[PDB]
Design an enzyme around this catalytic site. Structure first.
Site, PDB file in Angstrom:
ATOM      1  N   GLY A  78     -20.279 -59.300 -25.944  1.00 15.46           N
ATOM      2  CA  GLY A  78     -20.625 -58.876 -24.590  1.00 15.46           C
ATOM      3  C   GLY A  78     -21.406 -57.583 -24.409  1.00 15.46           C
ATOM      4  N   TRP A 122     -24.717 -56.789 -24.758  1.00 16.23           N
ATOM      5  CA  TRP A 122     -25.950 -56.924 -24.003  1.00 16.23           C
ATOM      6  C   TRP A 122     -25.655 -57.185 -22.525  1.00 16.23           C
ATOM      7  CZ3 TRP A 122     -30.729 -59.579 -26.637  1.00 16.23           C
ATOM      8  CH2 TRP A 122     -31.073 -58.809 -27.769  1.00 16.23           C
ATOM      9  N   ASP A 141     -22.360 -68.429 -25.586  1.00 19.12           N
ATOM     10  CA  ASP A 141     -22.057 -68.150 -27.004  1.00 19.12           C
ATOM     11  C   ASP A 141     -21.095 -69.224 -27.521  1.00 19.12           C
ATOM     12  OD1 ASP A 141     -20.854 -66.805 -29.554  1.00 19.12           O
ATOM     13  OD2 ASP A 141     -22.259 -65.286 -28.864  1.00 19.12           O
ATOM     14  N   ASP A 183     -22.073 -74.537 -27.724  1.00 18.51           N
ATOM     15  CA  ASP A 183     -23.153 -74.552 -28.702  1.00 18.51           C
ATOM     16  C   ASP A 183     -24.473 -74.728 -27.961  1.00 18.51           C
ATOM     17  OD1 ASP A 183     -24.971 -75.168 -30.755  1.00 18.51           O
ATOM     18  OD2 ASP A 183     -23.359 -76.018 -31.989  1.00 18.51           O
ATOM     19  N   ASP A 243     -29.943 -62.801 -28.540  1.00 19.81           N
ATOM     20  CA  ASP A 243     -29.514 -62.064 -29.723  1.00 19.81           C
ATOM     21  C   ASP A 243     -28.830 -63.086 -30.651  1.00 19.81           C
ATOM     22  OD1 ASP A 243     -29.434 -59.626 -31.152  1.00 19.81           O
ATOM     23  OD2 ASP A 243     -27.398 -59.176 -30.471  1.00 19.81           O
ATOM     24  N   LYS A 284     -34.210 -61.740 -30.765  1.00 21.47           N
ATOM     25  CA  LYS A 284     -33.970 -61.268 -32.132  1.00 21.47           C
ATOM     26  C   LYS A 284     -34.622 -62.296 -33.056  1.00 21.47           C
ATOM     27  CE  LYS A 284     -29.553 -60.831 -33.944  1.00 21.47           C
ATOM     28  NZ  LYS A 284     -29.212 -59.427 -34.303  1.00 21.47           N
TER      29      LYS A 284
END
Ligand SMILES: C[S@@+](CC[C@H](N)C(=O)[O-])C[C@H]1O[C@@H](n2cnc3c(N)ncnc32)[C@H](O)[C@@H]1O
Length: 180
Positions: free
Chosen positions: A34, A36, A54, A70, A95, A135
């Site tokens: 958590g 970000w 997530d 997912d 990310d 990322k």
């Protein structure tokens, strides 16, 4: 420390790129635990909101609609879109990183699949003029992915946050001005 390394990486990107403004609606991919989303709430304020996702569960955050699932599953994508609804999304932040085997020729493809899914989501939900922070790892597929991002956005920068371990092969592609 008071905040995670990930939180500091995004703070550095907000300082260099000014992505988050009061009241925006943001999509946070690979959100757990958590950092970000915590960081973005301080920037978008109580009237903005985040749709986060997530594989892992995470602490709730006021203003964050979190869906454990997912991201590769289209059913999960559908549920994320139900939370976005007709709200215009100004920033998609990812990310996401796969579990690492330690072998580049295996880990890079695993990671690249996730960022390609994040970019596809940008195509579908990011509003024109919006931003994408993602990322990405150096190596195979980096060149092609940067090219794909440059074709969808006006300005694209590759950032290596000071808080990002110099030893890590990660970089953050920061794209602004999603094209019409
Ligand atoms: C670098 S951590 C994210 C840290 C986050 N930015 C923060 O500030 O706390 C990457 C996350 O990506 C998630 N992830 C990897 N593959 C995923 C997938 N298929 N769907 C959803 N999340 C995924 C992981 O479970 C892991 O929590």
């Amino acid at each position: 420390g008071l905040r995670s390394r990930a939180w500091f990486k995004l703070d550095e990107i907000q300082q260099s790129d000014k992505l988050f403004k009061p009241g925006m609606t943001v999509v946070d991919l690979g959100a757990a635990p958590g950092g970000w989303s915590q960081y973005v709430v301080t920037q978008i304020g109580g009237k903005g909101r985040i749709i986060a996702c997530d594989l892992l569960p995470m602490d709730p955050i006021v203003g964050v609609d979190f869906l454990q699932g997912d991201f590769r599953d289209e059913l999960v994508m559908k549920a994320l879109l139900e939370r976005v609804g007709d709200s215009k999304v100004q920033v998609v932040m990812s990310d996401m990183a796969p579990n690492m085997s330690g072998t580049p020729a295996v880990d890079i493809p695993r990671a690249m699949y996730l960022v390609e899914l994040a970019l596809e989501m940008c195509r579908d939900v990011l509003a024109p003029g919006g931003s994408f922070v993602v990322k990405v790892f150096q190596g195979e597929g980096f060149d092609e992915y940067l090219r794909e991002i440059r074709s969808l956005f006006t300005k694209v920068k590759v950032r290596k946050p000071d808080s990002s371990r110099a030893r890590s092969r990660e970089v953050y592609i920061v794209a602004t001005g999603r094209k019409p």
